[PDB]
Amino acid sequence: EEHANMQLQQQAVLGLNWMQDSGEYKALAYQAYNAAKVAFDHAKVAKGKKKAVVADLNETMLDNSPYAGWQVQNNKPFDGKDWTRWVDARQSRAVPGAVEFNNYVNSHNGKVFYVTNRKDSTEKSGTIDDMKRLGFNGVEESAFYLKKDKSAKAARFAEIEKQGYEIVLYVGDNLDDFGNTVYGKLNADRRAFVDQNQGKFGKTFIMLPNANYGGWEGGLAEGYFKKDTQGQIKARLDAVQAWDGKL
Amino acid sequence: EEHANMQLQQQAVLGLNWMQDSGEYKALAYQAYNAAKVAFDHAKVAKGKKKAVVADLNETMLDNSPYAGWQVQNNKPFDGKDWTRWVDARQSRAVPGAVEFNNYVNSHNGKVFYVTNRKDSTEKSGTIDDMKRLGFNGVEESAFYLKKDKSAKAARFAEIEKQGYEIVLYVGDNLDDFGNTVYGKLNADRRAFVDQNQGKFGKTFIMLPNANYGGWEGGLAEGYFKKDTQGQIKARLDAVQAWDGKL
Numbered sequence A, B: 001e002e003h004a005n006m007q008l009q010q011q012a013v014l015g016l017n018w019m020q021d022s023g024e025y026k027a028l029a030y031q032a033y034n035a036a037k038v039a040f041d042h043a044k045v046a047k048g049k050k051k052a053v054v055a056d057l058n059e060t061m062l063d064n065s066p067y068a069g070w071q072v073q074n075n076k077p078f079d080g081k082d083w084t085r086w087v088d089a090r091q092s093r094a095v096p097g098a099v100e101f102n103n104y105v106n107s108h109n110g111k112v113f114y115v116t117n118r119k120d121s122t123e124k125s126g127t128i129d130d131m132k133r134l135g136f137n138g139v140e141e142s143a144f145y146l147k148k149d150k151s152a153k154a155a156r157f158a159e160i161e162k163q164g165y166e167i168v169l170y171v172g173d174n175l176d177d178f179g180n181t182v183y184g185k186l187n188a189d190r191r192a193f194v195d196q197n198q199g200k201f202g203k204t205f206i207m208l209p210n211a212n213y214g215g216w217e218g219g220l221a222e223g224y225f226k227k228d229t230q231g232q233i234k235a236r237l238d239a240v241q242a243w244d245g246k247l
C-alpha cells in the first residue's frame, strides 16, 4: 500500500532533518573524530605489528543522506536495488571530520581499512571514485573490505589482523561495526553490549550518530526486516515508550 | 487539524525509536561523558578560581523521552503547559553516564551547575526530586540556574563566573548550551558556529545527541516556532535534501 509506504518514510523526517541540517549533528561528528585522533595517538601495538584503524563507511565516513531524502520524497522503503543506483550516482558526501582523521592516520604510521557493507561486486567503483573526489588518501583497492558473502564484519576484521596489523580502534555508526556479538540481535541485547563496554566508547570504539537506519531498526522487533510495511510501522509504534499523561 | 497534528508527530517516530531503544544512542552518551571526564581532569583554571562544569539538563543529563512518546501517541505538538505537567509527573530518567560524571566532578574539586530551561518557578520541585532519586549529588538549590526571564543561557553562565568560578567545559544537546551567538538563528549560521569551533567538540564543548527537538528545529525556517502545524510540516519537508534519482 502506498499509504503505508508514505507513513513509514514520514517517520524518518525529523531524524533526517537533524542529520542533514543541524549544527548539532556536525558537532557530534567533530567530537567523534577529535576523540578518535587522541585514541590513535595514544595507541601502542605489540612488537612487530603495524597500527590499523578500522572504519565503517556509510554514515561514518560517507554521508548518504540524499538517498534517505529521496526515500521520503518518493515514499520508498529501503531497497538494495535503489541503493546500488544511489552508489552509482557518485553523489556521496563526507561526514564532517572524517577525511582529516583518515588522512592523519595514514600519514602518522597507521593505516585505515574500510570495512563496509557497500557491495564489493557492484558498489566498489562508485565508492572509490567518490572517496577520491572527497579527498580521502589511501583509497587503493587493498584498503577496502567491502561486502562479499557476509554482512557480519568480524571475519573481515580477522583478515586485517592476519595481514600483520593490530587494530587500535574502530569507528562506526552501528554496533555491528565493533564485532559480531550482537549481530542480528534485538535492542535489549545491543544495549547490554554497550553497557558491558561502557569505558571503550570515545576511546577504542568511536561512535557516529545515525537516527535513520541500522541494526537498531532491525532490533525493534523479532523478524523486523522480513515484516511488510504495515508490520514495520506497527513495530516502530509498539516500541515507543510513552508517558501516560498522569502524575 | 488533527490530521496535521498526527503527521507532525509521526515525523518524530524513527528518531525517537533510536533515542529510546538503540544501544547506539547509549554508546554516544557514554562517549560524551567519557570525553568529558578526560577534559575535566586535564583542565586548569586561573589562580584563585574554582573549577566549574556547566551542564544542560534536558536531553543532556535528564531523559524526557516518555514525553515525546506521549506526543506521538496523542498527536500532540509541543506545548509548555503539557511540559510542566510532565515535569510534575516526576518520571524523568537519567542520560547514560551523566550521574557518574556529575558525581565525579563534584567529588574531585569541581562543581557542576545546571543551566537549564526547565522553569524556575513551576518546574524546579519536580526537577530536584527526580535528580535526587536518580542519584545525582550536589542538587541543592544553589547549583541550579533554571529559566526565569530569558531562554538564552549566556547571562546565567556569566552569573556563575561572577561567583568566582572558571567554567572548564560545557555539556549540552543544543548549541545554545554553549553561548548565545547562534541563539534564534537558522541552521546555516548554527553549522558555521560549529565549523568555527571544530576543535572544541569532545574537549570543552561536550555534545549529546537529540534527534527529537531543539534549536535546530527552529533553525529549519525563519519564524518556524510561530508557524501553524501545516507550516511546520512544510518547513521540515522543504528542508529535506534529496537525491533526484538520476546518475
Ligand SMILES: NC(=O)c1ccc[n+]([C@@H]2O[C@H](COP(=O)(O)O)[C@@H](O)[C@H]2O)c1
Binding pocket: A056, A057, A058, A059, A064, A078, A080, A083, A115, A116, A117, A118, A119, A212, A213, A214
Ligand atoms: N534504510 C536502510 O536500511 C539502509 C539505508 C542506507 C544503507 N543501507 C545498507 O546498509 C549498508 C551500510 O553500509 P556500512 O557498513 O558502510 O554502514 C549499505 O551499504 C546498504 O546496503 C540500509
Ligand SMILES: NC(=O)c1ccc[n+]([C@@H]2O[C@H](COP(=O)(O)O)[C@@H](O)[C@H]2O)c1
Binding pocket: B056, B057, B058, B059, B064, B078, B080, B083, B115, B116, B117, B118, B119, B212, B213, B214
Ligand atoms: N518539542 C520541543 O520543542 C520540546 C521538547 C521537550 C522540552 N522542550 C522545552 O525545551 C527546554 C529544554 O530544557 P534544557 O535547557 O534543560 O534542554 C524544556 O525545559 C522545555 O521548555 C521543548
Ligand SMILES: [Mg+2]
Binding pocket: A056, A057, A058, A059, A060, A172, A173, A174
Ligand atoms: Mg555505517
Ligand SMILES: [Mg+2]
Binding pocket: B056, B057, B058, B059, B060, B172, B173, B174
Ligand atoms: Mg537540553
